[PDB]
Design a protein around this ligand. Structure first.
Ligand SMILES: [K+]
Ligand SMILES: [K+]
Ligand SMILES: [K+]
Ligand SMILES: [K+]
Ligand SMILES: [K+]
Ligand SMILES: [K+]
Ligand SMILES: [K+]
Ligand SMILES: [K+]
Ligand SMILES: [K+]
Ligand SMILES: [K+]
Ligand SMILES: [K+]
Ligand SMILES: [K+]
Ligand SMILES: [Mg+2]
Ligand SMILES: [Mg+2]
Ligand SMILES: [Mg+2]
Ligand SMILES: [Mg+2]
Ligand SMILES: [Mg+2]
Ligand SMILES: [Mg+2]
Ligand SMILES: [Mg+2]
Ligand SMILES: [Mg+2]
Ligand SMILES: [Mg+2]
Ligand SMILES: [Mg+2]
Ligand SMILES: [Mg+2]
Ligand SMILES: [Mg+2]
Ligand SMILES: [Mg+2]
Ligand SMILES: [Mg+2]
Ligand SMILES: [Mg+2]
Ligand SMILES: [Mg+2]
Ligand SMILES: [Mg+2]
Ligand SMILES: [Mg+2]
Ligand SMILES: [Mg+2]
Ligand SMILES: [Mg+2]
Ligand SMILES: [Mg+2]
Ligand SMILES: [Mg+2]
Ligand SMILES: [Mg+2]
Ligand SMILES: [Mg+2]
Ligand SMILES: [Mg+2]
Lengths: 260, 186, 181
RNA sequence: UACCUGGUUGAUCCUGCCAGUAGUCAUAUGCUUGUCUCAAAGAUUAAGCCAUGCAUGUGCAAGUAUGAACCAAUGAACUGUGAAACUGCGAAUGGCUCAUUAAAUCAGUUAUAGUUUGUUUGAUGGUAUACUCGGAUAACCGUAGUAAUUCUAGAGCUAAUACGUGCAACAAACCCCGACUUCUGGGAGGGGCGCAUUUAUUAGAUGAUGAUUCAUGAUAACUCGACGGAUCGCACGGCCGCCGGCGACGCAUCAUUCAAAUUUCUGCCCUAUCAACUUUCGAUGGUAGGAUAGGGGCCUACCAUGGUGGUGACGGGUGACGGAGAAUUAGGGUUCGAUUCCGGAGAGGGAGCCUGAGAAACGGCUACCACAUCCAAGGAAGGCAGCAGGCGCGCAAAUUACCCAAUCCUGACACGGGGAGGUAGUGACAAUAAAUAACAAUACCGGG
RNA sequence: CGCGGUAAUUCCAGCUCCAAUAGCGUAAUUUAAGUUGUUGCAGUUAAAAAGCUCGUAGUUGGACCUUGGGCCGCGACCCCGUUACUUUGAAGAAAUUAGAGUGCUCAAAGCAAGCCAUCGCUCUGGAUACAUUAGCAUGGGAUAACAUCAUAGGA
RNA sequence: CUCCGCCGGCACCUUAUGAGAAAUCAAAGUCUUUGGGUUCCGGGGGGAGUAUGGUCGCAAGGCUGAAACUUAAAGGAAUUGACGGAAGUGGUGGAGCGAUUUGUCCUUUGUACACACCGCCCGUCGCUCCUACCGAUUGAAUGGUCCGGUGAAGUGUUCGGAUCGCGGCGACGGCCGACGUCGCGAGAAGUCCAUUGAACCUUAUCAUUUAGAGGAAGGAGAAGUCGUAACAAGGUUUCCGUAGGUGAACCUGCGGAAGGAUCAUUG
């Protein structure tokens, strides 16, 4: 190619979007923004496929051009805006607030949150280093730069950001024993506590996580997001509570529900 | 045009590589600046990838030169090109390239040395600071003997064809001895 | 690109390797006559479905009884075989799935069950009755005789409400005859 | 379904092949063809040649209206709605094709501590007439030329977020020189000092990485720096003229995102009746440069003699784009993979470029070769392997239809546009379901 | 393979019958083929052991080294050489394949949907498996390969 | 000399519990209950060990080694019969995979015959077609490389300066306008060198396509001719290698084999 791609073929769209195969030749190509294209949930999908507010592309445009949707406290009119993990989606007309979390099957789920709980997001620190003028600055995986961060904050940390004031109100150090959520790979959406961190020089670092029921899983450092200090996450979790179920137990639940 | 691709080369085994694509613009080369030492300063704007700017010096006569032991940097005129390590053609053509050895005017450095040390190579405060600096003052007598002629041996550390400037450092110590031996063997 | 190109399709039957074997021809004709089939392909597709089910059951029998895939997929297969009336209650093992024949599948057709329910005088009369839109399963009329009837839907096979045999008005033949009279 | 059958003999048992038997999201062709759903479709030969039409344009309250434009109002700069045009952005995506290409593309897996990146998101921005600078130009208007083309000259006007200038709200700190002072110091004054650029010195300990003379600081200078707002909309209040909100557009830096480029390892069909190949004129490495966005013989100068090879180098063939995959498959395997997803490459063949963040672009330009169009013979204009359609070639493949309603992309943009894409037409490629009769009575044949 | 020379079960026809059936016939590739053979073929006489020997690469290479035992309790206890191999984990796009759910009327499909009827609800669902080789990591050391392997001159 | 052992060697006899299509084989066994290691080597019959290329050899030739085309069999072992210009009918049971055989003691033996020797068969020369090969003419046509050149166009560079602006000094004429005067800036055509480089010409080579007089194969089909070389001891047993000769099958010399017509002379 002689430049950037503008189109996303529907077959080549992320599989967690759960787009259907015959809905068209194309999928919404996510715009550049805070989250990666392959790891985000675009606004058009949230509005039409998930919340059912809109029925068409044009209806999503109509809703967004009314300035009805705020992402993390700010009005977005781009339909392909890449909304991502832990983002607050608020509609200050119906009075509903949503935190974009992962279910245990790797798919973004709009989790309803309280009005007070929609006043902060959780960000993962990507790096800490000196900017111009020798001023220390923090950057996250959701594209934010924060200057003069707390010196106790290091890379891979989780900071609590107040959307109203745009400051770090609290932070969590990436340590063994902190409850985490996996945001990438086959364990996406799984919640557990870190048991040990296995480091290997020159290559990716492996984190060993054990969930509440005792199942153990391992994932790379880049796919781990701390959500609480200790065994108590700072945000509310979806109904699964991050506890992945085997297909046999899912069938048990379905059989019990049908029997009732 | 000039390209930088590995397409046209032979393989490491010696076998010829058949072309599978025309030349791309993202692998181009441009013709050398061939910066000459001349008092007709010409630096041209080269528009490069990303909409960025490269400065292409064609003729230069003045440079920014650093005397590292003294930690002083002065703008001096370029007088001559004397040694090139890659091609004496560049010496006879007076071509300014990075790592070329040149003659630079010593007058700014003489002036700074007189002002700073009080030594040519009116207050109690000024005389006190001058005596403090003069204590431990040590020149190397090679820089001194070229100061006698007013020409300092210098090495162009900047790339004139890229930045449009002919900057460098004054030669000192073992490098100075090496290049004096080379110039006397020339 | 055309989006319609991504729709899947597949074949439902194979032809026999030996076309002119007396024994196979006699057995196929016996089944076809017993169940009023329109051609050999209707029996061949039932054999194809039985072949895929049998292959699945055999592949889970060649795995450990604790293999979580055999517990899961064998349970699903047994549920599907009990759902369509192909297996009894005592037959609650993957071994009995391997013992199923094309007769068991042909006995669950809407044609066969309409004939055996007393709604039709013969298997062929059942076939025409279904193709004439006189038969409904539940509230849904079914004009497809190869319809596989679940056990929960067996007791809801009934004459259509729009059909002259199910409380509806007389057909065009009868009405034309009375108009002539 | 882990399967065989005919054929050598006068007869037999073998070996062994021929023939039969089944499949093909496998092509063509023949005959036949009622209904439903589904659906390939000029790849194979010619990446052969193309008449005609269409496939890319774009306007918000928010850059620029004085249409001699329209509606409504009726001493006022500009009512509103606005064609045109300038300015901005896009046209580097998509679509098509598979010619070239055999460790090459490509796949998985690395790397950038070896780079560029319009845009998005987040953060950042201080030492350079002002109650606001200058000259043009389009549209418009009217003199034209030419056979002619979004071929073209001259004259009269007038805009800016076009172009070009120019105060740039002010400051501390820090560095250097340094009159005087009474003095290991104090110190007026002068110079430097925004950000960026280039070089050099220095700090970075015992902030960061597995690892950096790293991030970053300080200092000396340097650069004839396209930087550091002379822009627009809505609302317009608070103090006595001064302050004042919510936005839009734009400049620069870092980070992020969208990506590319290059790059590590391993992996490819047949052929030895291809065993040596590469190295003048780069072949393998080294030094110093040049060039590039950046590494690199990428190129140059000098130097050394290396580098690959029966573990098949080099060469040749491929009716060879690679992969995901497809057909057939007890298992193992065999064959295919032009085609809708990913990657690559090309736009008759080469080559070279401009613009631009991004192209060695072809529905952009320049030239040559080959074809070829109009001409008033002076010139002028070309590129369907986009959609449709037409010649030709062939065994072999559809309409010069409708539409942006869906999907989604793009623009100044909720609005325009989209032969992307969809809808219908042709369509026994292939696939799914499924009629052409059922019942009864007489008569017959029966059987039980 | 064969039939047809006057009685043609085989040609040309009629009748009847047979197979498949809205389909069927005819003209590269898979199966059949254990007729390419790794699984898995042959080589006295059917095709096929080089005339014979040496010999480099390649391929293949004898045996030997921490075993028992009990206790607690299937884990544990007690008395700065590599690699193959194996185990587990992370990856290996989607679509295709296998497969869970779901009565498009069935089916090929699709990724929908379902609920006594609900100004709504089921957080509705939109699983999972597979994915050579090569790469990364974990445990194991039986088997095997390479490197050593009495100046140990050891500590 | 005799007897008993052990190891190693050339062999022999019997037997199947084995294997095999059988003949037969104590390995040719330990094989669908399929795997000790390793080398070479076969894939229906011809064409064909032929053409061509390469290599070795003085040569003879050796090694490597096709294709086109043609054909439904060729071939192996064994059985019965027939023939030899070779010698002298069931049953049941048993053997064999079996055809068969024993019983039934013309037989044995060889067979490439089974229409059964009045058989089968080989080759030259005739004649109809097909395929392939060699082949001078330094045979042509097509394209790619090699060597020299020529070289569009672009890009960069050197001069160049049509022209256009801004200002300047002083002045003249009535802020405008003209001229002379002098700086700065922009800058077209053209031009210089370099670079990329299409394309053209030249030498030779390679890859193609490729006529081709003539020569010489192979196959198929009619089928004539001359003989009878292979099959019986085939009437000179057959065949292998090499050399020479002949109308043709072939003959002969030297060495070899039984696939022989002899498993046999302690006589
Ligand atoms: K690219
Ligand atoms: K553009
Ligand atoms: K790769
Ligand atoms: K470079
Ligand atoms: K080098
Ligand atoms: K642009
Ligand atoms: K649309
Ligand atoms: K739009
Ligand atoms: K012995
Ligand atoms: K008998
Ligand atoms: K003879
Ligand atoms: K003989
Ligand atoms: Mg098989
Ligand atoms: Mg494209
Ligand atoms: Mg630094
Ligand atoms: Mg270098
Ligand atoms: Mg090709
Ligand atoms: Mg392909
Ligand atoms: Mg092709
Ligand atoms: Mg196509
Ligand atoms: Mg593609
Ligand atoms: Mg291109
Ligand atoms: Mg063409
Ligand atoms: Mg081009
Ligand atoms: Mg075109
Ligand atoms: Mg294009
Ligand atoms: Mg009919
Ligand atoms: Mg007949
Ligand atoms: Mg065989
Ligand atoms: Mg023989
Ligand atoms: Mg033999
Ligand atoms: Mg051993
Ligand atoms: Mg074997
Ligand atoms: Mg053969
Ligand atoms: Mg008997
Ligand atoms: Mg004879
Ligand atoms: Mg004889």
């Amino acid at each position: 190619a002689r430049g950037l791609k503008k189109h996303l073929k529907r077959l080549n769209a992320p599989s967690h979007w759960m787009l259907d195969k015959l809905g068209g030749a194309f999928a919404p190509k996510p715009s550049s923004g805070p989250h990666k294209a392959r790891e985000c949930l675009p606004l058009i999908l949230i509005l039409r496929n998930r919340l059912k507010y809109a029925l068409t592309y044009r209806e999503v445009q109509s809703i967004l051009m009314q300035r009805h949707i705020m992402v993390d406290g700010k009005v977005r009119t781009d339909k392909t805006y890449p909304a991502g993990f832990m983002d607050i989606i608020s509609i200050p007309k119906t009075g509903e607030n949503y935190r974009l979390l992962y279910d245990t099957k790797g798919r973004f789920r709009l989790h309803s949150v309280r009005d007070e709980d929609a006043k902060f997001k959780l960000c993962k620190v990507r790096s800490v280093q000196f900017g111009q003028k020798g001023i220390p600055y923090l950057n996250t995986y959701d594209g934010r730069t924060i200057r003069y961060p707390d010196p106790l904050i290091k890379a891979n940390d989780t900071i609590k950001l107040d959307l109203e004031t745009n400051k770090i109100v609290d932070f969590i150090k990436f340590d063994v024993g902190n409850v985490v959520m996996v945001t990438g790979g086959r364990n996406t959406g799984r919640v557990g506590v870190i048991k040990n961190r296995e480091k290997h020089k020159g290559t990716f670092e492996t984190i060993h996580v054990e969930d509440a029921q005792g199942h153990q899983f391992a994932t790379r450092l880049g796919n781990v997001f701390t959500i609480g200090k200790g065994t108590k996450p700072w945000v509310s979790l979806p109904k699964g509570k991050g506890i992945k179920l085997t297909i046999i137990e899912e069938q048990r639940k379905r059989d019990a529900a049908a029997q009732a | 045009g000039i390209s930088r691709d590995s397409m046209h080369k032979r393989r490491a085994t010696g076998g010829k590589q058949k072309a599978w694509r025309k030349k791309r613009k993202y692998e181009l080369g441009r013709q050398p600046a061939n910066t000459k030492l001349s008092s007709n300063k010409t630096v041209r704007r080269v528009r490069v990838r990303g909409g960025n700017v490269k400065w292409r010096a064609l003729r230069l006569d003045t440079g920014n030169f650093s005397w590292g032991s003294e930690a002083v940097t002065r703008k001096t005129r370029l007088l001559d090109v004397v040694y090139n390590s890659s091609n004496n053609e560049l010496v006879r053509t007076q071509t300014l390239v990075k790592n070329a050895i040149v003659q630079v005017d010593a007058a700014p450095f003489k002036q700074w040395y007189l002002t700073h040390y009080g030594v040519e190579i009116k207050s109690n405060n000024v005389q006190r600071k001058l005596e403090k600096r003069q204590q431990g003052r040590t020149l190397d007598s090679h820089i001194e003997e070229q100061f006698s002629g007013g020409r300092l041996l210098a090495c162009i550390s900047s790339r004139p064809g890229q930045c449009g400037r002919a900057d460098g450092y004054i030669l000192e110590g073992k490098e100075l001895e090496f290049y004096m031996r080379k110039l006397q063997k020339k | 690109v055309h989006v319609n190109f991504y729709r899947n399709y597949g074949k439902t039957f194979k032809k026999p390797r030996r076309p002119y074997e007396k024994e196979r021809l006699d057995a196929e004709l016996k089944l076809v006559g017993e169940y009023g089939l329109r051609c050999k392909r209707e029996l061949w597709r039932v054999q194809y479905a039985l072949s895929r089910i049998r292959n699945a059951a055999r592949h889970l029998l060649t795995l450990d009884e604790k293999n979580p895939r055999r517990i899961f997929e064998g349970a699903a297969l047994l549920r599907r075989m009990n759902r369509y009336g192909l297996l009894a209650e005592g037959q609650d093992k993957l071994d009995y799935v391997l013992a199923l024949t094309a007769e068991n599948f042909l006995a669950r057709r809407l044609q066969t069950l309409v004939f055996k329910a007393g709604m039709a005088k013969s298997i062929h009369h059942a076939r025409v009755l279904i193709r004439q839109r006189h038969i409904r399963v539940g509230r849904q009329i079914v004009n497809v005789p190869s319809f596989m009837v679940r056990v929960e839907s067996e007791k809801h096979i009934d004459f259509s409400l729009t059909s002259p045999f199910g409380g509806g008005p007389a057909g065009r033949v009868k009405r034309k005859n009375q108009k002539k009279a």
